[PDB]
Symmetry: D2
């Protein structure tokens, strides 16, 4: 099983992608044992990025590692098809696309066509980015098999039956979970790991949970999972997307700049009060020697 | 009360806004009694348009009428701010914005700041575009009061209490409904009108339904309202965002081009069947003399 | 249009139906202008009542008025069929049944059979008691027409499109709304009125809203609707089912005893604090002379 | 971990509990490795049973095994209290109760008092039966701690995080899952077992799936788990509450009679098709020698 990082997108104060901070972050992640980097996902504000910025993220992370999965979806097919085709000159793992978002109650025929269209033009493996809440629709294991070109899938959902059903109807298919709270459970049940936002700021923890569960040390893996759960919950107090920046700076040293409004940054006060609820968690992670003081 | 068309965006076979076909559509809608025009809404594929293109829609429709509500929402705040500002040189009704979409569980603080921001920069009345299903968050009567700079609201929701509650807490706010199926109901219960997707292809009807109920002939209004309900339902067969293009050509007699993929046009086969579904309905409206022969 | 009362079931301290208090309440209701009394509904804890107690309520209210609709549904068909048949000796409006509750995802065939079975044996008109939330399933206007024996329907839902669709596919059918917050809107849109829990403790208000909306005085009817809304909301603070007893005693004089645990009564403190939030409302109802001091 | 059967209730053609057929079913389940028996659950049509009949189920199954969890829930508190008390003369595992069903938006106060009440009277360990979909309210990990007298919980829910969270906040509580499709997953992630509807007709499988995963052969466990998933799905064709009767007779070779209408039996025609759906599955289990010829 793997741990993939939907890598944050650091923005400058003038709202420009910080290519240089993004690189320092990708290095720390690969350094600390992350398997691949999932680019332009929700955690990096993919839908907030222009086709040229979605490509920036690729080009800046490709200076660091070629263990990349490249998300290209939007509400303009010609834009996505271009991004799919330009990735040909990048030796990477694959490209990804979430279902066309916003517009509710799209037909199963129109969604299957969107994905098949991207397979017809892709120069790399195609991963499905199934996120029913964010997109408004669910490409479940049945429609995934109907489309029939998905090398893998990130299933962002709380129902683990839904996720396992991909591996049931699509046996050859890689099946990752988007939930950070199921890292220990996904590792132990025979799926191919997790795509973990929380690994942006605690890659140490996400990897160690994976290892403990791999070692059939489940009682221990749950000890550490539940701790990571408490951080996922603290970041939720002030908007997790905006708190993901604060928590990477607190746990990993370097800062990642700013998010893109309306994903507003935390102010100095929200930052203090958030640090105040993970101090205790950071300490026990140090006492367990999972983190360096 | 008023009938407002969330006006379709015609696209060229090259995925380009057809400014001339849109002008034709605006003229016709106004000639047939549409009060105002809602530009860059869901029906018009706003979330699929760029800021440059959202602006193109404004300038193109402003060439024919200035009864315009200019939607300017997106996931980049600076873009919405610039659009809002540039409207200053236009004599229009107001600007509007849906809540930032996609991202789940945004903080009420972040949400309120997004809207209050657009108010601080707006050179025109600010209307709330409330669409919980598509955007993934609800700006209810309470949060609207909290923001407290909305001249009006378009509430796309099944719960009509929700709609009435904007008038309960904001006694001076215009409250419209996003339902085509409540044109008669809204009029009769003292709400201010309907932003009707279906007024794109049957303005005569949407305006007549309102008329009858306001003449206190509620039984005649339901009789015609129920006829319009069948056109709404039939359009939903092949995805109503795409079927509006086929229905406007059928009923209003001019071409509106294509939608923007992943909002796929209907093919010859699907278009053929949809017209069969509404053949009879056209006949009942031509008998009742709501439509020209 | 009508106002029907899903009449409370007063219980004694030893948890026995208080036939005598129930009668005093039914009289006040008919006295104050309520059209019919809906017996064994949610508001009277129907599902908490044994087949013999469901019959008690009938026999005790039939000493007062024959304007009764008699709810008989449960999870035992033989029990319901008996109650349907014993009502033959009562000259009343009809019998009612909510869809079989609790068990999720029952088949459309098994639900249509439950209702048709009760029509085959009923000696009175059969009303549908559609409450999707309480029962877990929705007998929408299409399945109502499929069953094809419903004289009417109480539609407990916030979506008024759903409710109107009964009158669209079932034109002969009586269509009442279960929502107390749509009394003014239902009266004005051409449906046959409301079944109002709130008329247990403010029948004066529910009737006056109906009358104002009947008089096409909608701006005035909304004034009074929104007030009733504030009481529906106050009763919600402490469990509305349990607060319905306190609010009938506060506004109508007589007390109705106790509810049936786990619908626990309010304690003296919750009763005081509830009275504290409707004092102001009771006053303005007096100043508008809708209520006698 | 453990496998627990929510044991079916056999009914006579006269809508009467078949105490002798139930005894047969209990014996067989125990002989085939079922740890305990959950009496008067959803699968057993508890909410359709009277207190007298819920008690009949206890005495009948207690004639064969005392590994019983005695469900005693209802909408009359006194009834549940009396059932709880009468269990004192039995050497059973515990008593259980779902949250009071039907009535929406019950107060957390009223809910907690309902459960704490059953604890104050219980002569046995109290297990929480958590089933948000059917009952209409969720007793999550936090409210369980707040009540704080539950030896264990059966969590019928798709969100497996929800389930893990009982163990997070209540480190000493037994946490079971109500999913047949997570027998392998639960075992492997350190949770305490599954209350499986499907163990009624395929105990051999449900116990084997658990076995394999606990022998660390997770790939073999999924292989058999996915086979059981097809039996769950097929049963759902004609309503799985009724299909269990047909599947137990098919697989275990004895008759369990009828369910209780409105939980309608399958007819000759529906029963015929369901067996066709599971013909092949029986073959794969007989080859793999999980079933006798
Ligand atoms: O970054 C992604 O898109 C992935 C991980 C999900 O859990 C994410 O939805 C969290 O917000
Ligand atoms: O299209 C819009 O922007 C508005 C009109 C509503 O009726 C529509 O949103 C319903 O989907
Ligand atoms: O009493 C009934 O069953 C009816 C009225 C509904 O609004 C009720 O559900 C309120 O709780
Ligand atoms: O039947 C019960 O009481 C329990 C077992 C669960 O698996 C079932 O409730 C799912 O519907």
């Amino acid at each position: 099983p793997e741990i993939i990082t939907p890598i944050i997108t650091p923005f400058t104060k003038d709202n420009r992608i910080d290519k240089e901070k993004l690189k320092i972050h990708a290095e720390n992640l690969i350094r600390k044992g992350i398997d691949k980097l999932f680019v332009n996902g929700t955690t990096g504000l993919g839908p907030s990025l222009s086709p040229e910025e979605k490509l920036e993220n690729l080009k800046a992370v490709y200076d660091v590692t070629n263990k990349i999965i490249f998300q290209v979806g939007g509400l303009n097919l010609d834009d996505a098809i271009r991004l799919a085709k330009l990735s040909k000159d990048f030796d990477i793992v694959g490209i990804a696309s979430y279902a066309p978002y916003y517009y509710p109650r799209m037909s199963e025929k129109h969604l299957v066509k969107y994905f098949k269209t991207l397979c017809e033009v892709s120069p790399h493996p195609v991963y499905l980015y199934n996120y029913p809440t964010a997109t408004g629709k669910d490409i479940d294991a049945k429609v995934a098999k109907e489309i029939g070109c998905f090398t893998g899938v990130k299933d962002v959902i709380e129902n683990i039956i839904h996720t396992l059903d991909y591996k049931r109807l699509n046996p050859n298919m890689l099946v990752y979970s988007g939930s950070d709270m199921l890292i220990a459970t996904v590792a132990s049940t025979g799926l191919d790991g997790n795509v973990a936002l929380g690994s942006n700021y605690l890659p140490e923890v996400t990897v160690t949970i994976k290892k403990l569960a791999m070692e059939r040390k489940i009682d221990e893996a749950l000890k550490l999972q539940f701790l990571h759960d408490e951080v996922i919950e603290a970041s939720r107090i002030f908007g997790s997307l905006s708190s993901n920046y604060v928590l990477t700076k607190y746990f990993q040293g370097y800062d990642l700049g700013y998010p893109r409004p309306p994903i507003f940054p935390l102010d100095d006060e929200e930052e203090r009060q958030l640090i105040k609820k993970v101090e205790g968690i950071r300490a026990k992670l140090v006492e367990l020697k999972i983190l360096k003081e």
